[PDB]
Symmetry: D2
Subunit: 241 residues, 4 copies
């Protein structure tokens, strides 16, 4: 239980759901974990549940000054899990401009400029692993998810460009594309949606967040030392059908 000993791991949106479980797995493997989120009360609680010296830093990925402060507060990261993200739904005809801009500001812009800062240090040191959390709706057309799927699709392309830009200096970049997963947000907002998506999956069920974190752990760890530029689908068969 020491495969990540000596590595610092930053997990955006790591105070709930898939981010919480990914930070838990990496702390248990000996990494020094930093998690971020907006709600300070819930972030400090999440860092205690995780234990192993995990610490919380408040940051809003939608504000670029906050992103730059986060990068300043963790200038030595070996594992970056870009997990923070929102996914409100609306048909194209119902979608508003302000919601469009917040989705791109949060899901794309904040992750882009955090990577620009953190990867520079990884490239200097000659080692690092970056994992971007995407979505099945970025690979198939589900009505109501045009904007959300478009943000994660841009992340899929960034995974490829970044892997080619940083690979010469030993830095790996990959995506984890999850299917419908039971998290507090999906339970509150999209309770029937995830169940409807699940009826069309081969495994015919939704995922526990731990099952998604297991794929994040693999790609972050040195077990995936030859894995870069790729997408790891964790969707119970959704992309296959």
């Amino acid at each position: 239980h020491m495969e990540l000993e000596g590595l610092t791991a930053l997990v955006t949106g790591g105070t709930s759901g898939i981010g919480l479980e990914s930070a838990r797995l990496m702390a248990a493997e000996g990494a020094d974990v930093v998690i971020t989120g907006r709600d300070a009360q819930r972030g400090e609680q999440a860092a205690a549940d995780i234990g192993h010296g995990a610490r919380f830093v408040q940051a809003d990925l939608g504000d670029l000054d906050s992103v730059a402060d986060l990068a300043a507060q963790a200038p030595d990261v070996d594992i970056l899990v870009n997990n923070a993200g929102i996914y409100p739904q609306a048909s194209t005809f119902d979608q508003d401009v302000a919601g469009f801009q917040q989705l791109f500001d949060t899901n794309v812009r904040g992750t882009y400029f955090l990577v620009a800062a953190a990867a520079k240090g990884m490239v200097a040191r000659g080692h690092g692993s970056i994992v971007n959390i995407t979505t099945l709706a970025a690979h198939k057309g589900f009505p109501g998810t045009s904007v959300y799927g478009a943000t994660k699709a841009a992340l899929e392309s960034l995974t490829r460009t970044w892997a080619a830009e940083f690979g010469a200096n030993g830095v790996r970049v990959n995506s984890v594309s999850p299917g419908p997963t039971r998290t507090p947000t999906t339970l509150e907002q999209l309770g029937d949606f995830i169940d409807d998506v699940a009826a069309g999956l081969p495994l015919r069920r939704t995922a526990a967040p731990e099952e998604i974190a297991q794929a994040v752990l693999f790609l972050a760890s040195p077990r995936a030392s030859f894995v870069t530029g790729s997408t790891l689908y964790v969707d119970g068969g959704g992309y296959a059908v």
Copy 2:
């Protein structure tokens, strides 16, 4: 013999390059063609050279008020070609915030809300065809194209979602993903870049803009009556290698 006789088409960025050749092919096929651009002088010259009653409407895809006024001036369209776009290059470490936001405003946001307006009439009438121009860098990792490829990969996802949302009402949606093409902008800005990309293509050459336009015409026309939600790669084999 004019297969598009009776239809109205709107080509964004149709005053030079791939867009101008797509408009010329459609106007020759008997469609009533509207072309848009930012510079009014070169717009009127383009409309004049195209002939066949083609008209110009000035619009800036980056300004949403301008996009709204464009939708008003061309309300009922049967063919929409989303071709307008920009592609400046920079490494992820050199990329600036202003340039990031302009690339997404022009390539993604403007097309999104033009479609939201144009597709409403296509759905009500029960027929229509939308063609989105993407890029090879959205499917393979090219250093220096992180943002640009990310904007076009968002558009690839929108093609899938939109085809699922508008399909029941007869509206088709597809992408054309071009390889390196000789245009006014690539010959003045990316002269050595396109030949470098051409060297690793199975066809070992760059394309004329008309060669890209033939794919756009096919997808816009009743010949492609069963084609929707897909990408047509016109790239000399780049995606295959």
Copy 3:
């Protein structure tokens, strides 16, 4: 007449998607050769098409027949690899003999016909090769395991051939169709294509003429910069 002066060979050109592809190309001025196993159906198909289209009898599952076909039509500019069978069975039900027949017909016959015909294209410096695949080679449909695999092998062959022949100007592409109303899909698989169509954004099956239009495009000079790619003609099947 876009295809004037060009010779086109269509395997399985006596019925269904192949028949309509040959009809389109003949109407474009091409000298079309259609092939099939049944001599009566072939002669009737050539008359139905017109335009000097001629029939040549061959069995793609027999390599001697394949070699005999390439000898009767040595100089082809357009080759449409359309002949194929698609019987359905779950993996637990699938028999050995049907497995071998599916690969013999759908893969081996096309491979060595391409090896023969593409030699002349490469030496002449031009040509277009269109391989007919299937949606089941891209998504998992129960009961189509062997069929999808043969067409997936064909998809990969498109990429390898595009790279090997592209230096000499020869293009290679795949057409991946959705459920199409041919006499075979109506006799057998009658309700399967309906179930598939209900899950497509267009919510319908295709007429064979609609698949043929994609074959015509990739085969013609209009697609001069298109090689190594898959053109999906499936009502949105791949996107959902």
Copy 4:
């Protein structure tokens, strides 16, 4: 401890990627059965692996040998379809006999081994199948036409099998490796530079991907391709 109580069958487990995959699983508590044609290397590989691992001789090109193999291990929880060959020749140079052997070995033998082993997995309601493919099945590399076609067929089978068996809890996935320093590859290549990582892989690096997909860690991963190729597919 993670694979304790499970039985894993690795075809081509006496060398290269297969040997390292079977090694990782045995060291995780699985009862490992490896298979190959050569009996002397097979018994050595079984002793090399240790942990009670055993060797069963079989030729994937002979369906009677494949049937005998399945009957000697009817209770497999993990199946790694790793045996394969990859000779090269341009399309114009490819011979009929070599074409048929490539499909007989890489596709037919795997297909009917799966048809037997998946029955027990479906009955029990759990199991994991891992098919080893190749980058050449997704990109066009001159000289790999037949080899890549056989692996592309496996890629499609992964999806169909995921749909057919997933209705009863059985997962099926592909592992697509890049260039790897196995004994066959070192002899065939003699004297990679286009990959983002700019190096070839050690066999153990491919085996780690096999292990993850085979283990309960990947409990929600099915029908997918895991690319372990130094960035080849992305470029």
